[PDB]
Amino acid sequence: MNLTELKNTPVSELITLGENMGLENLARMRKQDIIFAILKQHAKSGEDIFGDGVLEILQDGFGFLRSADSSYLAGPDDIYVSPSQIRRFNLRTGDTISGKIRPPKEGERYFALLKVNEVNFDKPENARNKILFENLTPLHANSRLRMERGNGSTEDLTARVLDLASPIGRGQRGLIVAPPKAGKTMLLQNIAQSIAYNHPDCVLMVLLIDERPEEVTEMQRLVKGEVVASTFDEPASRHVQVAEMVIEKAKRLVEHKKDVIILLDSITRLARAYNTVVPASGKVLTGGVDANALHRPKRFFGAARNVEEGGSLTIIATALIDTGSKMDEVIYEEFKGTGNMELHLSRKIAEKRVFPAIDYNRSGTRKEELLTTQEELQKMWILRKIIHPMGEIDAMEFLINKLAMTKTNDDFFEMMKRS
Amino acid sequence: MNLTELKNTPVSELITLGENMGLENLARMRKQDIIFAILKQHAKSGEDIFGDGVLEILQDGFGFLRSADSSYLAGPDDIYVSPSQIRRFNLRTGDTISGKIRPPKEGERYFALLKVNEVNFDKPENARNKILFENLTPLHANSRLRMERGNGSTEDLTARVLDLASPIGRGQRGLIVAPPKAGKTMLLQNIAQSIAYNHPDCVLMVLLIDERPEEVTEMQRLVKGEVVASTFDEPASRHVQVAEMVIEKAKRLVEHKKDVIILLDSITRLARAYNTVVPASGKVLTGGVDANALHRPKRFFGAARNVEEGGSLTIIATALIDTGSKMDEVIYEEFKGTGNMELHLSRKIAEKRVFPAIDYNRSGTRKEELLTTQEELQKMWILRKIIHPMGEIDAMEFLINKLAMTKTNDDFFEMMKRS
RNA sequence: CCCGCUGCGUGUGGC
Ligand SMILES: Nc1ncnc2c1ncn2[C@@H]1O[C@H](COP(=O)(O)OP(=O)(O)O)[C@@H](O)[C@H]1O
Ligand SMILES: Nc1ncnc2c1ncn2[C@@H]1O[C@H](COP(=O)(O)OP(=O)(O)O)[C@@H](O)[C@H]1O
Ligand SMILES: Nc1ncnc2c1ncn2[C@@H]1O[C@H](COP(=O)(O)OP(=O)(O)O)[C@@H](O)[C@H]1O
Ligand code: BEF
Ligand code: BEF
Ligand SMILES: [Mg+2]
Ligand SMILES: [Mg+2]
């Protein structure tokens, strides 16, 4: 029992609940009004009411608990938190809070809360002395996020090729670059499925920025976890603040020694939104990029790291290259200077239609020896040496038609060694 | 005992110290409060507290001894030095001062220095009669900094190739120019190891401006010297302040006839920070560079020189090219006009996964006859004549698989002359 | 030969 359940419950159920116990209503107004009336009558009955939300701090000192359904923006229902509670519990923006709430008093249009009992999914006083995110000691990615599933399915081929080309570890700063219609979004979907299957302990938060609504619905339907989105019909500031809220929530989760994974549908459009919202400095680089536009995107992308104290933040963002515009090229080569994993998809392999359309020679990760073991690293070395002389197309066809009949990558390696 | 000595000890040790013979405390507050309390009680005994720092002189006349843990920035404990002491000892910004401090009394908000005992690791009676940095007569580099080792290991190979392409001397202005992912940071790490092993007498300082925090941790746990860092999380103003503090410290050390070596993880990011901080003048160069933006980067880079009076300052920095934005192109081609040593790494050799990915033909140093012997220069000329016709990837493969079987460069030259 | 001390425009986006 909490505010969220009543928010997501069907209108018929809540109208019946108000009808039998409570004053009758014919439901001539909005559902939120009926929810407010039900909350009022339940508070009058004397029963405590629960509430949940992700905290966002305002410049005055008070904060609002935004809801995930509204994609963490302001809305009609936003629990108010006083600066006194924030100071007492040392809360920061992005800290999810669950606790007892109260209906608004006179002159108040938002619910308030009197007690908290779940701060970032644990007992609240643990927030008294936790090490801050910027105070953690970062490290190179040590643990490996194996995307391989071993079921032998056709979609498992993309995960296997991902494992072979550019290994992904915990705390990786990854980029997936390709021209449009080259297989980016479906690669992200396959990555999300592999994460959900292999690594259920990780907190997967798929963030879509400046993307088509149909893809938003597809992600919400076929992804197990949390999906937040901001379609392309929304302003740039919308995308900007959604991204800030998501990254702050991820940082707060990491502060509690959690493994957090974020999949970004496109970092190029996030950089474009940041450029649009940035004040003009009078200096413009190649393309339309403002000189000071890329600081905040750099911070957002570089929030991903491997923490020695425990937990990690992985970010896998897609990007556009070879689109005929220097904006995308400069964005890619500027985020190439801060990322770790790089995966290239080429339109030539996509037109030839052999999927996944991965450019093996142009894709790799930094410090692969820290993820793969010695024998696996040597096998990867041999495979890359064999693949490199061949072109992209024939190498991809040879690899795909060479590991398809093999269930596991280890068996593929040993069969390469045998033959 | 020093103040920094109490900083470096764990909180448990200092709280036990404060509990066994000092006032009892259960440590409910921050560490700095305990440090202040124990220092005040120790001064109340009638003895003398000690401390140390690096001097930064404010525009009003007084100064503060910043600490390395705060990246030589304003922290919550900075020993105050009166203008009288500065005038007495002719102290300038960046001087490392160690001496007797006193606790803050009423009206005093930070610690204060009353007696000094060491200025730049020397008695304070030598700083009054020294020659300022700007008055030292500059000179071309004469003493060679041998990066070679007798190990024969693979990691030595890179250093060896450096000794063949661009010899490095004391007082050089180095530029490791390459696109992203070419190998600049690993090459800088190898240079740091070579400096630490071959030349332990040189003062090695590593400056990382706007780079990955994991690389900062790797430098800290790998470099045998001093590491000062400012990751991309910080703004450009912090970057420039840290840069000026480091360069002032290096200049003060050079004024005492010391060999100082500075390694810059990226001079391009420093130039970008200076461009963002500089006031607009209405004139913008191609690529988005302000017209008056590169003067201070020029001063920072040209602070490196060989001093005839004794000592030297050697700055080796990494730069960026082929990013797709002409900002980096103009920055590199402008720093090439104020440097001595250029070492180029090509992205395509890196994609071949052949390391080091040095561009031998585009790499060289100015006035190499002053750093090498006659026979060594003759052999280097012969090798360059051999290498020049062949392609860059072929050249690097030939060089690597030719000097892999020789422990030193002399054996490589002997086997090339013989065969 | 006697002297008063010291926004937009342009540029940058731009080939
Ligand atoms: N593994 C795959 N199998 C079949 N088609 C694919 C695959 N990956 C991508 N595609 C094709 O890509 C097109 C859409 O591009 P998508 O993969 O969603 O990334 P993006 O839209 O970002 O380019 C679809 O028409 C789909 O047919
Ligand atoms: N001497 C070397 N030996 C082996 N690998 C190297 C060497 N130098 C660079 N690399 C490779 O380069 C990657 C790191 O590149 P880095 O130097 O960080 O790029 P940048 O020069 O743009 O900072 C690592 O994954 C590493 O495998
Ligand atoms: N006539 C020459 N003989 C030998 N070396 C030369 C000659 N002219 C230039 N160099 C080489 O060029 C380098 C200096 O170039 P410099 O003339 O300073 O460049 P800039 O033209 O930018 O001033 C020296 O290291 C030297 O080896
Ligand atoms: F067409 Be997709 F955006 F590569
Ligand atoms: F990718 Be490197 F930092 F240029
Ligand atoms: Mg897409
Ligand atoms: Mg680097």
mmCIF file with all atom_site columns, C-alpha atoms in Angstrom, chain B residues 28-192:
data_model
loop_
_atom_site.group_PDB
_atom_site.id
_atom_site.type_symbol
_atom_site.label_atom_id
_atom_site.label_alt_id
_atom_site.label_comp_id
_atom_site.label_asym_id
_atom_site.label_entity_id
_atom_site.label_seq_id
_atom_site.pdbx_PDB_ins_code
_atom_site.Cartn_x
_atom_site.Cartn_y
_atom_site.Cartn_z
_atom_site.occupancy
_atom_site.B_iso_or_equiv
_atom_site.pdbx_formal_charge
_atom_site.auth_seq_id
_atom_site.auth_comp_id
_atom_site.auth_asym_id
_atom_site.auth_atom_id
_atom_site.pdbx_PDB_model_num
ATOM 1   C CA . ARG B 1 28  ? 31.559 12.097 16.087  1.00 0.00 ? 28  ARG B CA 1
ATOM 2   C CA . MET B 1 29  ? 32.923 14.899 13.870  1.00 0.00 ? 29  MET B CA 1
ATOM 3   C CA . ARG B 1 30  ? 35.321 15.306 10.954  1.00 0.00 ? 30  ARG B CA 1
ATOM 4   C CA . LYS B 1 31  ? 39.028 14.489 11.044  1.00 0.00 ? 31  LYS B CA 1
ATOM 5   C CA . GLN B 1 32  ? 40.169 18.094 10.569  1.00 0.00 ? 32  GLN B CA 1
ATOM 6   C CA . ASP B 1 33  ? 38.431 19.113 13.803  1.00 0.00 ? 33  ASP B CA 1
ATOM 7   C CA . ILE B 1 34  ? 40.379 16.433 15.685  1.00 0.00 ? 34  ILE B CA 1
ATOM 8   C CA . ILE B 1 35  ? 43.583 17.633 14.018  1.00 0.00 ? 35  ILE B CA 1
ATOM 9   C CA . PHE B 1 36  ? 42.903 21.240 15.022  1.00 0.00 ? 36  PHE B CA 1
ATOM 10  C CA . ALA B 1 37  ? 42.068 20.242 18.601  1.00 0.00 ? 37  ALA B CA 1
ATOM 11  C CA . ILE B 1 38  ? 45.173 18.091 19.038  1.00 0.00 ? 38  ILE B CA 1
ATOM 12  C CA . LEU B 1 39  ? 47.393 20.776 17.496  1.00 0.00 ? 39  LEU B CA 1
ATOM 13  C CA . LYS B 1 40  ? 45.932 23.426 19.811  1.00 0.00 ? 40  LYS B CA 1
ATOM 14  C CA . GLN B 1 41  ? 46.431 21.200 22.860  1.00 0.00 ? 41  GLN B CA 1
ATOM 15  C CA . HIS B 1 42  ? 49.974 20.381 21.728  1.00 0.00 ? 42  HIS B CA 1
ATOM 16  C CA . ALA B 1 43  ? 50.763 24.090 21.386  1.00 0.00 ? 43  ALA B CA 1
ATOM 17  C CA . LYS B 1 44  ? 49.250 24.745 24.820  1.00 0.00 ? 44  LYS B CA 1
ATOM 18  C CA . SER B 1 45  ? 52.007 22.524 26.247  1.00 0.00 ? 45  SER B CA 1
ATOM 19  C CA . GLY B 1 46  ? 54.489 25.259 25.279  1.00 0.00 ? 46  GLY B CA 1
ATOM 20  C CA . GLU B 1 47  ? 56.257 23.339 22.503  1.00 0.00 ? 47  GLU B CA 1
ATOM 21  C CA . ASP B 1 48  ? 56.260 24.102 18.754  1.00 0.00 ? 48  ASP B CA 1
ATOM 22  C CA . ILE B 1 49  ? 53.998 22.770 15.993  1.00 0.00 ? 49  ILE B CA 1
ATOM 23  C CA . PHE B 1 50  ? 55.526 22.105 12.578  1.00 0.00 ? 50  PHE B CA 1
ATOM 24  C CA . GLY B 1 51  ? 54.065 22.290 9.094   1.00 0.00 ? 51  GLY B CA 1
ATOM 25  C CA . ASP B 1 52  ? 54.864 22.595 5.417   1.00 0.00 ? 52  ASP B CA 1
ATOM 26  C CA . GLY B 1 53  ? 53.303 23.575 2.127   1.00 0.00 ? 53  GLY B CA 1
ATOM 27  C CA . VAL B 1 54  ? 53.680 25.347 -1.204  1.00 0.00 ? 54  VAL B CA 1
ATOM 28  C CA . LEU B 1 55  ? 53.355 29.122 -1.079  1.00 0.00 ? 55  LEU B CA 1
ATOM 29  C CA . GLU B 1 56  ? 50.673 30.949 -3.055  1.00 0.00 ? 56  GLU B CA 1
ATOM 30  C CA . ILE B 1 57  ? 50.772 34.738 -2.721  1.00 0.00 ? 57  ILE B CA 1
ATOM 31  C CA . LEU B 1 58  ? 47.471 36.597 -2.905  1.00 0.00 ? 58  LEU B CA 1
ATOM 32  C CA . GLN B 1 59  ? 47.078 40.009 -4.518  1.00 0.00 ? 59  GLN B CA 1
ATOM 33  C CA . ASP B 1 60  ? 46.658 41.685 -1.120  1.00 0.00 ? 60  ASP B CA 1
ATOM 34  C CA . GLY B 1 61  ? 50.177 40.713 -0.050  1.00 0.00 ? 61  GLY B CA 1
ATOM 35  C CA . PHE B 1 62  ? 49.700 37.823 2.357   1.00 0.00 ? 62  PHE B CA 1
ATOM 36  C CA . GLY B 1 63  ? 50.063 34.204 1.291   1.00 0.00 ? 63  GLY B CA 1
ATOM 37  C CA . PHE B 1 64  ? 48.895 30.686 2.053   1.00 0.00 ? 64  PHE B CA 1
ATOM 38  C CA . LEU B 1 65  ? 50.780 27.381 2.137   1.00 0.00 ? 65  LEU B CA 1
ATOM 39  C CA . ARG B 1 66  ? 48.621 25.108 0.012   1.00 0.00 ? 66  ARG B CA 1
ATOM 40  C CA . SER B 1 67  ? 48.894 21.327 0.228   1.00 0.00 ? 67  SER B CA 1
ATOM 41  C CA . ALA B 1 68  ? 49.330 18.691 -2.457  1.00 0.00 ? 68  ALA B CA 1
ATOM 42  C CA . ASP B 1 69  ? 46.241 16.701 -1.446  1.00 0.00 ? 69  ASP B CA 1
ATOM 43  C CA . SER B 1 70  ? 44.032 19.655 -2.428  1.00 0.00 ? 70  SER B CA 1
ATOM 44  C CA . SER B 1 71  ? 45.931 19.995 -5.741  1.00 0.00 ? 71  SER B CA 1
ATOM 45  C CA . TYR B 1 72  ? 47.577 23.168 -4.395  1.00 0.00 ? 72  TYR B CA 1
ATOM 46  C CA . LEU B 1 73  ? 44.208 24.909 -4.100  1.00 0.00 ? 73  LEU B CA 1
ATOM 47  C CA . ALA B 1 74  ? 42.389 26.692 -1.297  1.00 0.00 ? 74  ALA B CA 1
ATOM 48  C CA . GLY B 1 75  ? 41.571 24.106 1.349   1.00 0.00 ? 75  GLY B CA 1
ATOM 49  C CA . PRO B 1 76  ? 40.137 24.206 4.861   1.00 0.00 ? 76  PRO B CA 1
ATOM 50  C CA . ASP B 1 77  ? 43.617 24.276 6.486   1.00 0.00 ? 77  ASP B CA 1
ATOM 51  C CA . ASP B 1 78  ? 46.230 26.552 4.904   1.00 0.00 ? 78  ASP B CA 1
ATOM 52  C CA . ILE B 1 79  ? 49.077 28.067 6.896   1.00 0.00 ? 79  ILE B CA 1
ATOM 53  C CA . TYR B 1 80  ? 48.935 31.852 6.611   1.00 0.00 ? 80  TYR B CA 1
ATOM 54  C CA . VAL B 1 81  ? 52.167 33.741 5.932   1.00 0.00 ? 81  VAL B CA 1
ATOM 55  C CA . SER B 1 82  ? 52.335 37.493 6.515   1.00 0.00 ? 82  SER B CA 1
ATOM 56  C CA . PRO B 1 83  ? 53.726 39.867 3.870   1.00 0.00 ? 83  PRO B CA 1
ATOM 57  C CA . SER B 1 84  ? 56.525 40.713 6.306   1.00 0.00 ? 84  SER B CA 1
ATOM 58  C CA . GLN B 1 85  ? 57.888 37.158 6.121   1.00 0.00 ? 85  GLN B CA 1
ATOM 59  C CA . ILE B 1 86  ? 57.533 37.128 2.328   1.00 0.00 ? 86  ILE B CA 1
ATOM 60  C CA . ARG B 1 87  ? 59.523 40.356 2.052   1.00 0.00 ? 87  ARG B CA 1
ATOM 61  C CA . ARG B 1 88  ? 62.064 39.093 4.593   1.00 0.00 ? 88  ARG B CA 1
ATOM 62  C CA . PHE B 1 89  ? 62.830 35.866 2.721   1.00 0.00 ? 89  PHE B CA 1
ATOM 63  C CA . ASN B 1 90  ? 62.111 37.111 -0.836  1.00 0.00 ? 90  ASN B CA 1
ATOM 64  C CA . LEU B 1 91  ? 59.527 34.361 -1.249  1.00 0.00 ? 91  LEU B CA 1
ATOM 65  C CA . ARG B 1 92  ? 57.539 34.038 -4.474  1.00 0.00 ? 92  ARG B CA 1
ATOM 66  C CA . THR B 1 93  ? 54.529 31.992 -5.529  1.00 0.00 ? 93  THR B CA 1
ATOM 67  C CA . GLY B 1 94  ? 55.235 28.271 -5.662  1.00 0.00 ? 94  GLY B CA 1
ATOM 68  C CA . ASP B 1 95  ? 57.963 28.195 -3.011  1.00 0.00 ? 95  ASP B CA 1
ATOM 69  C CA . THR B 1 96  ? 57.889 25.074 -0.846  1.00 0.00 ? 96  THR B CA 1
ATOM 70  C CA . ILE B 1 97  ? 58.164 26.290 2.751   1.00 0.00 ? 97  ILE B CA 1
ATOM 71  C CA . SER B 1 98  ? 58.483 24.107 5.852   1.00 0.00 ? 98  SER B CA 1
ATOM 72  C CA . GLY B 1 99  ? 58.627 25.607 9.310   1.00 0.00 ? 99  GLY B CA 1
ATOM 73  C CA . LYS B 1 100 ? 57.101 26.268 12.698  1.00 0.00 ? 100 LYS B CA 1
ATOM 74  C CA . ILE B 1 101 ? 53.399 27.132 12.781  1.00 0.00 ? 101 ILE B CA 1
ATOM 75  C CA . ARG B 1 102 ? 51.075 28.425 15.496  1.00 0.00 ? 102 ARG B CA 1
ATOM 76  C CA . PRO B 1 103 ? 47.413 27.667 16.198  1.00 0.00 ? 103 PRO B CA 1
ATOM 77  C CA . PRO B 1 104 ? 44.825 30.292 15.222  1.00 0.00 ? 104 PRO B CA 1
ATOM 78  C CA . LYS B 1 105 ? 43.893 32.620 18.071  1.00 0.00 ? 105 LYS B CA 1
ATOM 79  C CA . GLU B 1 106 ? 40.793 34.805 18.325  1.00 0.00 ? 106 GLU B CA 1
ATOM 80  C CA . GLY B 1 107 ? 40.260 36.691 15.089  1.00 0.00 ? 107 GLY B CA 1
ATOM 81  C CA . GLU B 1 108 ? 42.367 34.043 13.316  1.00 0.00 ? 108 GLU B CA 1
ATOM 82  C CA . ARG B 1 109 ? 40.575 31.535 11.092  1.00 0.00 ? 109 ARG B CA 1
ATOM 83  C CA . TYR B 1 110 ? 43.433 29.484 9.613   1.00 0.00 ? 110 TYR B CA 1
ATOM 84  C CA . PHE B 1 111 ? 46.828 28.481 10.946  1.00 0.00 ? 111 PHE B CA 1
ATOM 85  C CA . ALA B 1 112 ? 49.765 30.883 10.842  1.00 0.00 ? 112 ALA B CA 1
ATOM 86  C CA . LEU B 1 113 ? 53.497 30.519 10.236  1.00 0.00 ? 113 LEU B CA 1
ATOM 87  C CA . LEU B 1 114 ? 55.891 32.131 12.710  1.00 0.00 ? 114 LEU B CA 1
ATOM 88  C CA . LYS B 1 115 ? 59.282 30.585 11.881  1.00 0.00 ? 115 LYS B CA 1
ATOM 89  C CA . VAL B 1 116 ? 60.546 28.938 8.698   1.00 0.00 ? 116 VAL B CA 1
ATOM 90  C CA . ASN B 1 117 ? 63.257 26.289 8.596   1.00 0.00 ? 117 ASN B CA 1
ATOM 91  C CA . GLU B 1 118 ? 63.353 25.114 4.966   1.00 0.00 ? 118 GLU B CA 1
ATOM 92  C CA . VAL B 1 119 ? 62.730 26.925 1.679   1.00 0.00 ? 119 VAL B CA 1
ATOM 93  C CA . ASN B 1 120 ? 62.752 24.684 -1.405  1.00 0.00 ? 120 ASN B CA 1
ATOM 94  C CA . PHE B 1 121 ? 64.484 21.970 0.640   1.00 0.00 ? 121 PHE B CA 1
ATOM 95  C CA . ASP B 1 122 ? 67.245 24.390 1.630   1.00 0.00 ? 122 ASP B CA 1
ATOM 96  C CA . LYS B 1 123 ? 68.094 26.690 4.506   1.00 0.00 ? 123 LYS B CA 1
ATOM 97  C CA . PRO B 1 124 ? 66.268 30.027 4.158   1.00 0.00 ? 124 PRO B CA 1
ATOM 98  C CA . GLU B 1 125 ? 69.541 31.970 4.014   1.00 0.00 ? 125 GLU B CA 1
ATOM 99  C CA . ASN B 1 126 ? 70.122 31.016 0.360   1.00 0.00 ? 126 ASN B CA 1
ATOM 100 C CA . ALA B 1 127 ? 66.871 32.303 -1.170  1.00 0.00 ? 127 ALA B CA 1
ATOM 101 C CA . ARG B 1 128 ? 67.754 35.957 -0.537  1.00 0.00 ? 128 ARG B CA 1
ATOM 102 C CA . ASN B 1 129 ? 70.753 35.904 -2.891  1.00 0.00 ? 129 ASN B CA 1
ATOM 103 C CA . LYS B 1 130 ? 69.487 33.840 -5.837  1.00 0.00 ? 130 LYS B CA 1
ATOM 104 C CA . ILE B 1 131 ? 68.761 34.715 -9.464  1.00 0.00 ? 131 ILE B CA 1
ATOM 105 C CA . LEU B 1 132 ? 65.139 34.903 -10.565 1.00 0.00 ? 132 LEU B CA 1
ATOM 106 C CA . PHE B 1 133 ? 63.832 32.479 -13.170 1.00 0.00 ? 133 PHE B CA 1
ATOM 107 C CA . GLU B 1 134 ? 63.266 35.152 -15.819 1.00 0.00 ? 134 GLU B CA 1
ATOM 108 C CA . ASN B 1 135 ? 66.839 36.428 -15.387 1.00 0.00 ? 135 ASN B CA 1
ATOM 109 C CA . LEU B 1 136 ? 68.487 33.046 -15.989 1.00 0.00 ? 136 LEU B CA 1
ATOM 110 C CA . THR B 1 137 ? 70.203 32.824 -19.364 1.00 0.00 ? 137 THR B CA 1
ATOM 111 C CA . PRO B 1 138 ? 68.437 30.148 -21.445 1.00 0.00 ? 138 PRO B CA 1
ATOM 112 C CA . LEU B 1 139 ? 70.298 27.613 -23.533 1.00 0.00 ? 139 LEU B CA 1
ATOM 113 C CA . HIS B 1 140 ? 69.747 24.715 -25.885 1.00 0.00 ? 140 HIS B CA 1
ATOM 114 C CA . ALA B 1 141 ? 69.462 21.236 -24.412 1.00 0.00 ? 141 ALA B CA 1
ATOM 115 C CA . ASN B 1 142 ? 72.861 19.615 -23.833 1.00 0.00 ? 142 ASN B CA 1
ATOM 116 C CA . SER B 1 143 ? 72.532 16.772 -21.319 1.00 0.00 ? 143 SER B CA 1
ATOM 117 C CA . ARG B 1 144 ? 70.754 13.764 -22.805 1.00 0.00 ? 144 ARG B CA 1
ATOM 118 C CA . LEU B 1 145 ? 67.917 12.050 -20.931 1.00 0.00 ? 145 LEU B CA 1
ATOM 119 C CA . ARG B 1 146 ? 68.450 8.390  -21.826 1.00 0.00 ? 146 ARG B CA 1
ATOM 120 C CA . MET B 1 147 ? 65.102 6.592  -21.769 1.00 0.00 ? 147 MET B CA 1
ATOM 121 C CA . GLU B 1 148 ? 66.745 3.278  -22.680 1.00 0.00 ? 148 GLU B CA 1
ATOM 122 C CA . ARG B 1 149 ? 67.089 0.409  -20.218 1.00 0.00 ? 149 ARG B CA 1
ATOM 123 C CA . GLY B 1 150 ? 69.099 -2.790 -20.097 1.00 0.00 ? 150 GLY B CA 1
ATOM 124 C CA . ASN B 1 151 ? 66.070 -4.901 -19.176 1.00 0.00 ? 151 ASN B CA 1
ATOM 125 C CA . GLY B 1 152 ? 65.354 -6.156 -22.679 1.00 0.00 ? 152 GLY B CA 1
ATOM 126 C CA . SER B 1 153 ? 61.654 -6.363 -21.811 1.00 0.00 ? 153 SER B CA 1
ATOM 127 C CA . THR B 1 154 ? 58.850 -5.502 -24.215 1.00 0.00 ? 154 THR B CA 1
ATOM 128 C CA . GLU B 1 155 ? 57.905 -2.360 -22.278 1.00 0.00 ? 155 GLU B CA 1
ATOM 129 C CA . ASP B 1 156 ? 61.469 -1.131 -22.808 1.00 0.00 ? 156 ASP B CA 1
ATOM 130 C CA . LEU B 1 157 ? 61.055 -1.379 -26.590 1.00 0.00 ? 157 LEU B CA 1
ATOM 131 C CA . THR B 1 158 ? 58.917 1.760  -26.746 1.00 0.00 ? 158 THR B CA 1
ATOM 132 C CA . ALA B 1 159 ? 61.535 3.752  -24.849 1.00 0.00 ? 159 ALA B CA 1
ATOM 133 C CA . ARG B 1 160 ? 64.228 2.401  -27.160 1.00 0.00 ? 160 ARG B CA 1
ATOM 134 C CA . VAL B 1 161 ? 62.266 3.499  -30.223 1.00 0.00 ? 161 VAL B CA 1
ATOM 135 C CA . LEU B 1 162 ? 61.982 6.947  -28.658 1.00 0.00 ? 162 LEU B CA 1
ATOM 136 C CA . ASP B 1 163 ? 65.763 7.143  -28.320 1.00 0.00 ? 163 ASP B CA 1
ATOM 137 C CA . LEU B 1 164 ? 65.971 6.409  -32.042 1.00 0.00 ? 164 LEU B CA 1
ATOM 138 C CA . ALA B 1 165 ? 63.288 8.840  -33.212 1.00 0.00 ? 165 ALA B CA 1
ATOM 139 C CA . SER B 1 166 ? 63.347 11.941 -30.985 1.00 0.00 ? 166 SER B CA 1
ATOM 140 C CA . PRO B 1 167 ? 66.169 12.131 -28.431 1.00 0.00 ? 167 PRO B CA 1
ATOM 141 C CA . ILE B 1 168 ? 65.136 13.915 -25.237 1.00 0.00 ? 168 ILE B CA 1
ATOM 142 C CA . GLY B 1 169 ? 67.447 16.209 -23.291 1.00 0.00 ? 169 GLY B CA 1
ATOM 143 C CA . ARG B 1 170 ? 67.246 18.364 -20.199 1.00 0.00 ? 170 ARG B CA 1
ATOM 144 C CA . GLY B 1 171 ? 65.238 21.486 -20.949 1.00 0.00 ? 171 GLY B CA 1
ATOM 145 C CA . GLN B 1 172 ? 63.277 20.115 -23.900 1.00 0.00 ? 172 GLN B CA 1
ATOM 146 C CA . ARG B 1 173 ? 59.745 21.047 -24.922 1.00 0.00 ? 173 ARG B CA 1
ATOM 147 C CA . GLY B 1 174 ? 58.190 17.739 -25.905 1.00 0.00 ? 174 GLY B CA 1
ATOM 148 C CA . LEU B 1 175 ? 54.957 17.103 -27.773 1.00 0.00 ? 175 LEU B CA 1
ATOM 149 C CA . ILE B 1 176 ? 53.497 13.598 -28.018 1.00 0.00 ? 176 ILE B CA 1
ATOM 150 C CA . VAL B 1 177 ? 51.112 14.314 -30.898 1.00 0.00 ? 177 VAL B CA 1
ATOM 151 C CA . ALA B 1 178 ? 48.585 11.661 -31.904 1.00 0.00 ? 178 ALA B CA 1
ATOM 152 C CA . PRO B 1 179 ? 44.854 11.092 -32.390 1.00 0.00 ? 179 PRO B CA 1
ATOM 153 C CA . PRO B 1 180 ? 42.827 9.509  -29.575 1.00 0.00 ? 180 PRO B CA 1
ATOM 154 C CA . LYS B 1 181 ? 43.594 5.861  -28.704 1.00 0.00 ? 181 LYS B CA 1
ATOM 155 C CA . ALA B 1 182 ? 47.011 6.016  -30.412 1.00 0.00 ? 182 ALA B CA 1
ATOM 156 C CA . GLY B 1 183 ? 49.040 5.420  -27.254 1.00 0.00 ? 183 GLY B CA 1
ATOM 157 C CA . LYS B 1 184 ? 50.078 8.799  -25.853 1.00 0.00 ? 184 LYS B CA 1
ATOM 158 C CA . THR B 1 185 ? 49.201 8.026  -22.230 1.00 0.00 ? 185 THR B CA 1
ATOM 159 C CA . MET B 1 186 ? 50.970 4.658  -22.192 1.00 0.00 ? 186 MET B CA 1
ATOM 160 C CA . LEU B 1 187 ? 54.008 6.265  -23.820 1.00 0.00 ? 187 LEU B CA 1
ATOM 161 C CA . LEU B 1 188 ? 53.995 8.964  -21.134 1.00 0.00 ? 188 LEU B CA 1
ATOM 162 C CA . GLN B 1 189 ? 53.820 6.238  -18.485 1.00 0.00 ? 189 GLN B CA 1
ATOM 163 C CA . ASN B 1 190 ? 56.804 4.497  -20.076 1.00 0.00 ? 190 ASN B CA 1
ATOM 164 C CA . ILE B 1 191 ? 58.704 7.795  -20.121 1.00 0.00 ? 191 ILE B CA 1
ATOM 165 C CA . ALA B 1 192 ? 57.903 8.207  -16.425 1.00 0.00 ? 192 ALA B CA 1
#
